[PDB]
Write a protein that binds this ligand. Structure first.
Ligand SMILES: CCCCCCCCCCCCCCCCCC(=O)OC[C@H](COP(=O)(O)OCCN)OC(=O)CCCCCCCCCCCCCCCCC
Ligand SMILES: CCCCCCCCCCCCCCCCCC(=O)OC[C@H](COP(=O)(O)OCCN)OC(=O)CCCCCCCCCCCCCCCCC
Ligand SMILES: CCCCCCCCCCCCCCCCCC(=O)OC[C@H](COP(=O)(O)OCCN)OC(=O)CCCCCCCCCCCCCCCCC
Ligand SMILES: CCCCCCCCCCCCCCCCCC(=O)OC[C@H](COP(=O)(O)OCCN)OC(=O)CCCCCCCCCCCCCCCCC
Ligand SMILES: CCCCCCCCCCCCCCCCCC(=O)OC[C@H](COP(=O)(O)OCCN)OC(=O)CCCCCCCCCCCCCCCCC
Ligand SMILES: CCCCCCCCCCCCCCCCCC(=O)OC[C@H](COP(=O)(O)OCCN)OC(=O)CCCCCCCCCCCCCCCCC
Ligand SMILES: CCCCCCCCCCCCCCCCCCCC
Lengths: 504, 601
């Protein structure tokens, strides 16, 4: 009953951010702050009242909360939301990152700031809707819902130092990739619904009824491939990754845009919720190809991140490699690897959010993004290079941060299932250390390679320092005490895994 | 007892306080905070040892919380304390406190005083986590922590890019070792379902009754992690280049914390290694060859730092030889004594560097016995302990125990490798001493001077009950072993005096010869392993990064857009605006539609 409000509070908040711009130009940032605060507080209350640590696995369907309302009764389409542990963790994560995105866009007050905030809130509400929707048409609708505010954020409010045409090019590349993949997913959804209708005779887009739909191996493989292509563009999975560094480089220079739209992983959750249960045999036969695609993604993302002269492109390719790890984890049959994948998703969200925020602050201070135009910035800036050192250490895979817990539980489960791919992925961890040290050496250590680098730069203010330190504390606590997260996601992960391994 | 968590927490508190101070505090306050955290850890270690010996040397366990729990995957955040853990903890805390006091004197007037002490406090905390961990994953936490702190401390002078390059090299080689260690963890958990050491050695003989290949793989990957952290073959190339950092960093890394971690890895997991005898013999062979190559390389170095680095490499090779011949007590005894005298040697070389300037070549300096007498005495005592001078130094008794253990287990080849290594150790050590020193009573220096003598050999680690007893040698055979080791060290000292103390004509004639020049160039570059690793790993990595620097997968996914633009431009040629062509196109389409209907029918 709170899930409709979990989606509607961002949308009403964005409408109010647009509407209360007339009383002041410093007002819409406030209204955005309250609406993401209430969204985060509602998600936290759903965590507190859910009792996710005590609930046991009983098989799909098993939702801690549910909501249904008919939307298009001709096709059997309803606004059908449901929440369990995995969805709850993703919703709490996107609420926290939405609050951090509102905080990151602070002190940036100009005309049509309310429209920026409205686009931000609509992106975040669409992300929450993808995490909550458990009927296929509403899931697809929310899937394509975020991309229009995302497109207008990249194209209109993007990197102000760009030509103006490159921002439009990156936004168009991102939109075309994501929407063509979504359309292929819609073809798969439609064909699955028609197969179910030919089997039974009733229209349903509900995911619970579409489970155990009798179909042949070729048809199931094709439907799984359509779903996988949609989830592979947005994960990203190589070679469908090309939109990501260009969208990150041309995104609004605060980096709040990255946190709100580009950095959350609806694709891994989509694979876990709708690929493995809906098509278990097809996912079982597709597992070698997807695991090798994940291996290639790890090493390709590492080699790309090492070759970048741009910080933002570097961090985007770090995201590519870590999602290669998650893609290997998803197609195993291991509960341990799935729990590691959940921890990895949360920790990569936190760590990449910190990295992108710190890069935005660094660009604000030095007005350039070329690593060859700076050096020895440790001696010039008070707080930023040490926190950037911590976040490079976190994305490196260091114990004490949640990234290590995620990667290593993934690798333990994967080695129980597939040893060779696990070995190659650990050498991927070596490559990750290589690019993290390369970024640290090129940016903050050495001598100044330009005149702007050899100047005393102003320190971080209290708000941005406090949000960075909150991210640091959350990453350290996730590294040392990841048990509440595992207890939250345990029942959902057990349901997904027991469905996937018992039907093959 | 029940204060091991305090021995971890106090360096952590010091690291957090000194990092968040970020240079705002005075040098005195930052100094007392850092050295007080490490000294309080040492004092709590002393109280823990007193309580441990007050009981019947029984193993203590302090489970703080549970780290991870996914089904059967139950990784605990528990500390353990036995004789081996107490030995390594006391060595780490005490020698780290001495090095911290020396650095409190030494780092005065330097940028990043508090940053240095924060990094060294995190180093101490990481190594205490490493030695106190009851399971392999918490030990991996400590392993990665000491790797990260070594990277942060080697490249402490970040303004020079050479120090940063050396730090990145050390981190990358140690991370390759840590990936091998991760493979060991994955195999052990997949086979036995636990990572606790006692549970692993209890469960392994029952599980591996039919097949032993997975236990062999697990111990081989444990050995790979050990040689990654201990700078042995084939992951030893980082140690010589890690000399870019300050001398307290070098003393900490080469004596207290980093290179000693592989020895603790093999000793703590000795139960698994005893069930794979070939892998343990490989440990011994790796230690023997590593000590031989390090002795060859230390003979031709032109810097005090590099001589001491390859000396550390050879002594860790001695420890690995002792582990491979099942002389565990000898290995840990040599660990403690080598920590003492190698810390003494590195702090004395730091005083040499401070007293002189610009980090001169060893041939530029000469006749320094008169300007600095106490530093010369510290170098003499450290060199005598390193060269195993009989009955005066603790290193003599340590190498005596190692070689006697190699004798008693029927390892003749490793014994003679150790004897050759001791001869050359005396040779290169007193070569450096007689080249540098021929031609104000600080407390840590005095304490390590006392501990480098036989007073250090009076301290015996309480390993009875943890590690198995080495088989005892016969009295006559061990007496001839003592005599042979003593005269080998003595003629090494005498050859170093005849060879480099004086006109130095014969060494000049040997070095200027063409085979002499070739061998000197070969041994100066650590037998060409840096060149080979560069050409085999670093060059193709940079080549692939340059070949892929403009995203090829993005281009082969962007070619549909190129085809779309080309086809659209081609189709726009039909819209020429001519009405007669439009009529012609309608008639062509009529012909096509009619022909298609007649063909398909
Ligand atoms: C402007 C120019 C540029 C734009 C346009 C470019 C081209 C766009 C179109 C591309 C796709 C072409 C069509 C692909 C689907 C082909 C379907 C097919 O051949 O189906 C035959 C068969 C049907 O199954 P059936 O035999 O009926 O089952 C019952 C008993 N077995 O099927 C089977 O039995 C199963 C066959 C499975 C494999 C076929 C699909 C291959 C897909 C390749 C791409 C995806 C690769 C994997 C993912 C990569 C990373 C995301
Ligand atoms: C745990 C036991 C050991 C086991 C192994 C653990 C391994 C992993 C541990 C990772 C810890 C972080 C290591 C990498 C980041 C180091 C940051 C750093 O260099 O801090 C020093 C810096 C002060 O340097 P300075 O040059 O004096 O000043 C800056 C410019 N004037 O400091 C600053 O500028 C200010 C501080 C910056 C951030 C410091 C580190 C943050 C992370 C640790 C504390 C987190 C908060 C505490 C609460 C945790 C949750 C309860
Ligand atoms: C690796 C170094 C050694 C470990 C200490 C420092 C680790 C990092 C510190 C910051 C993060 C701490 C995260 C964990 C906090 C404690 C976790 C907890 O509450 O565990 C529950 C447990 C209750 O007992 P039990 O029934 O056994 O429950 C088992 C758990 N499933 O609770 C207990 O039993 C509580 C036991 C006492 C815990 C005291 C921790 C003090 C930490 C002070 C650190 C100061 C510096 C912080 C920054 C460090 C560098 C990042
Ligand atoms: C052969 C048998 C024995 C094998 C033993 C195991 C492998 C040991 C490998 C040791 C060598 C590693 C050397 C690493 C050096 C890193 C420091 C360095 O040189 O940095 C240079 C460069 C810096 O980057 P940049 O920022 O561009 O530079 C600024 C100014 N130059 O940074 C770089 O150029 C980065 C270089 C990255 C190197 C990646 C190495 C990957 C290692 C994979 C090991 C696989 C082992 C198993 C192989 C299969 C066995 C069957
Ligand atoms: C001398 C001093 C110490 C030096 C270091 C130690 C020596 C290291 C020598 C090897 C180099 C490191 C590689 C380690 C590989 C470990 C392999 C392993 O653990 O395999 C276990 C796995 C068990 O499978 P099993 O249960 O037998 O399945 C059959 C059903 N009974 O077994 C199998 O499934 C068999 C095949 C396993 C896979 C082998 C090849 C993996 C790929 C290696 C790539 C390395 C380079 C990566 C480069 C990335 C790109 C640059
Ligand atoms: C049962 C066994 C008993 C023991 C048998 C012998 C074991 C090995 C003993 C080696 C040491 C012998 C002592 C005398 C030679 C070494 C000391 C010396 O004279 O060094 C001179 C020179 C380095 O001195 P430097 O500081 O550069 O010169 C001062 C500047 N004017 O030195 C040089 O530049 C190079 C000197 C080379 C001396 C000969 C080395 C012989 C061994 C070569 C091994 C080659 C690799 C292995 C085989 C590969 C295949 C052929
Ligand atoms: C501020 C309080 C300082 C207390 C220091 C306590 C320790 C004394 C000084 C260091 C001595 C180091 C000696 C190491 C001996 C290791 C013996 C190991 C036995 C198993």
């Amino acid at each position: 009953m709170l899930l409709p409000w979990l989606i509607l509070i961002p949308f009403i908040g964005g409408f109010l951010c647009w509407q209360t711009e007339r009383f002041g130009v410093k007002v819409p940032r406030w209204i955005a702050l309250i609406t993401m605060g209430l969204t985060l507080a509602l998600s936290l209350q759903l965590w507190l009242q859910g009792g996710y640590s005590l609930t046991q696995s009983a098989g799909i369907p098993q939702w801690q909360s549910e909501f249904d309302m008919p939307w298009i009764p001709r096709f059997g389409i309803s606004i059908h939301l449901a929440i369990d542990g995995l969805s709850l963790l993703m919703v709490v994560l996107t609420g926290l990152l939405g609050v951090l995105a509102v905080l990151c866009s602070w002190k940036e007050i100009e005309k049509y700031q309310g429209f920026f905030h409205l686009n931000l809130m609509w992106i975040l509400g669409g992300v929450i809707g993808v995490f909550l929707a458990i009927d296929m048409f509403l899931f697809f609708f929310f899937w394509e819902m975020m991309l229009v505010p995302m497109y207008f954020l990249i194209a209109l409010w993007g990197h102000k130092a760009s030509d103006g045409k490159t921002r439009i090019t990156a936004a168009t590349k991102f939109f075309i990739y994501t929407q063509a993949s979504g359309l292929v997913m819609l073809i798969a959804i439609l064909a699955l619904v028609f197969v179910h209708y030919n089997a039974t005779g009733v229209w349903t887009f509900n995911y619970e009824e579409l489970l155990n739909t009798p179909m042949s191996s070729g048809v199931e493989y094709l439907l799984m491939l359509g779903f996988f292509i949609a989830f592979a563009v947005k994960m990203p999975v190589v070679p469908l990754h090309g939109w990501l560094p260009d969208a990150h480089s041309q995104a609004p220079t605060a980096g709040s845009v990255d946190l709100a739209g580009i950095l959350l992983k609806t694709a891994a959750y989509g694979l876990l919720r709708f690929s493995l249960p809906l098509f278990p045999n097809a996912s079982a036969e597709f597992a070698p190809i997807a695991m090798w695609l994940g291996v290639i993604g790890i090493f390709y993302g590492a080699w790309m991140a090492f070759a970048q002269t741009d910080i933002k492109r570097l961090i985007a390719y770090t995201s590519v490699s870590h999602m290669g790890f998650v893609l290997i984890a998803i197609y195993t049959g291991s509960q341990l690897a799935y729990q590691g994948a959940v921890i990895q998703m949360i920790a990569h969200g936190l760590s990449a959010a910190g990295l992108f925020i710190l890069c935005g602050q660094l660009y604000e201070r030095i007005h350039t993004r070329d690593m060859r135009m700076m050096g020895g910035l440790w001696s010039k800036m008070k707080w930023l290079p040490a926190l950037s050192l911590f976040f490079a250490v976190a994305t490196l895979g260091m114990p004490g941060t949640g990234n290590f817990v995620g990667e290593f539980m993934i690798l333990f489960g994967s080695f129980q299932v597939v040893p060779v791919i696990t070995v190659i992925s650990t050498f991927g961890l070596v490559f990750a250390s290589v690019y993290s040290l390369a970024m640290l050496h090129r940016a903050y250590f050495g001598k100044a390679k330009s005149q702007i680098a050899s100047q005393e730069l102003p320190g971080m203010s209290l708000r941005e320092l406090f949000m960075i330190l909150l991210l640091v504390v959350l990453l350290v606590l996730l590294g040392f005490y990841p048990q509440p997260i595992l207890d939250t996601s345990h029942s959902a992960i057990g349901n997904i895994q027991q469905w996937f391994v018992n039907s093959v | 007892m029940n204060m091991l968590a305090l021995t971890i927490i106090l360096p952590l508190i010091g690291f957090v306080l000194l990092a968040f101070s970020r240079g705002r505090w005075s040098e005195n306050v930052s100094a007392i905070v850092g050295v007080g955290s490490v000294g309080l850890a040492a004092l709590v270690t002393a109280f823990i040892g007193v309580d441990f010996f007050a009981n019947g040397e029984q193993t203590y366990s302090q489970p703080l919380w549970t780290w991870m729990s996914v089904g059967d995957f139950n990784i605990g955040f528990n500390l353990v304390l036995d004789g081996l853990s107490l030995t390594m903890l006391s060595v780490v805390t005490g020698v780290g406190f001495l090095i911290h006091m020396y650095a409190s004197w030494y780092m005065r007037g330097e940028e990043g005083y508090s940053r240095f002490f924060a990094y060294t406090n995190l180093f101490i905390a990481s190594m205490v986590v490493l030695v106190l961990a009851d399971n392999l994953l918490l030990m991996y936490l400590g392993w990665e922590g000491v790797g990260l702190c070594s990277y942060l401390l080697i490249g402490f002078y970040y303004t020079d890019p050479k120090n940063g390059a050396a730090a990145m090299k050390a981190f990358v080689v140690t991370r390759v070792g840590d990936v091998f260690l991760a493979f060991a963890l994955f195999i052990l958990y997949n086979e036995l379902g636990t990572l606790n050491f006692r549970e692993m050695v209890e469960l392994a003989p029952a599980h591996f009754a039919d097949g032993n290949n997975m236990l062999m793989w697990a111990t081989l990957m444990l050995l790979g992690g050990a040689v990654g952290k201990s700078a042995q073959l084939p992951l030893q190339t980082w140690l010589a280049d890690a000399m870019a950092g300050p001398t307290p960093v070098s003393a900490l890394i080469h004596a207290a914390t980093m290179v000693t971690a592989g020895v603790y890895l093999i000793a703590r997991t000795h139960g698994l290694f005893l069930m794979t005898p070939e892998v343990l013999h490989l440990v011994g062979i790796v230690g023997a060859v590593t000590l031989l190559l390090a002795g060859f390389a230390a003979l031709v170095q032109t810097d005090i730092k590099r001589v001491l680095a390859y000396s550390t490499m050879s002594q860790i090779g001695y420890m690995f030889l002792a582990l491979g011949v099942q002389a565990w007590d000898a290995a840990i005894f040599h660990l403690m004594t080598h920590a003492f005298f190698k810390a003494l040697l590195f702090l004395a070389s730091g005083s040499v560097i401070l007293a002189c300037h610009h980090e001169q070549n060893i041939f530029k300096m000469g006749g320094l016995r008169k300007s600095i007498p106490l530093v010369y005495l510290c170098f003499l005592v450290g060199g005598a302990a390193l060269s195993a001078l009989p009955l005066v130094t603790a290193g003599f008794f340590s190498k005596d125990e190692i070689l006697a253990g190699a004798m008693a287990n029927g390892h003749i080849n490793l014994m003679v490798a150790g004897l050759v290594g001791a001869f050359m150790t005396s040779l290169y050590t007193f070569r450096m001493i007689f080249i540098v020193f021929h031609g104000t009573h600080s407390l840590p220096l005095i304490v390590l001077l006392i501990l480098s003598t036989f007073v250090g050999a009076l301290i015996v680690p309480p390993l009875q009950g943890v590690l198995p007893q080495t088989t005892e040698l016969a009295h006559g055979s061990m007496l001839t072993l003592e005599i042979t080791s003593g005269v080998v060290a003595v003629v090494g000292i005498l050859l170093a005096a005849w060879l480099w103390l004086g006109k130095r004509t014969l060494v000049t004639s040997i070095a200027n010869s063409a085979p002499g020049r070739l061998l000197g160039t070969w041994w100066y570059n650590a037998w060409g392993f840096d060149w080979l690793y560069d050409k085999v790993f670093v060059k193709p990595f940079l080549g692939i990064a340059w070949l892929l620097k403009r995203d090829p997968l993005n281009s082969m996914m962007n070619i549909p857009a190129v085809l779309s633009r080309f086809a659209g431009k081609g189709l726009l040629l039909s819209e020429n605006g001519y009405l007669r062509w439009y009529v012609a196109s309608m008639s062509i389409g009529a012909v096509v539609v009619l022909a298609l209907l007649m063909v398909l029918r």
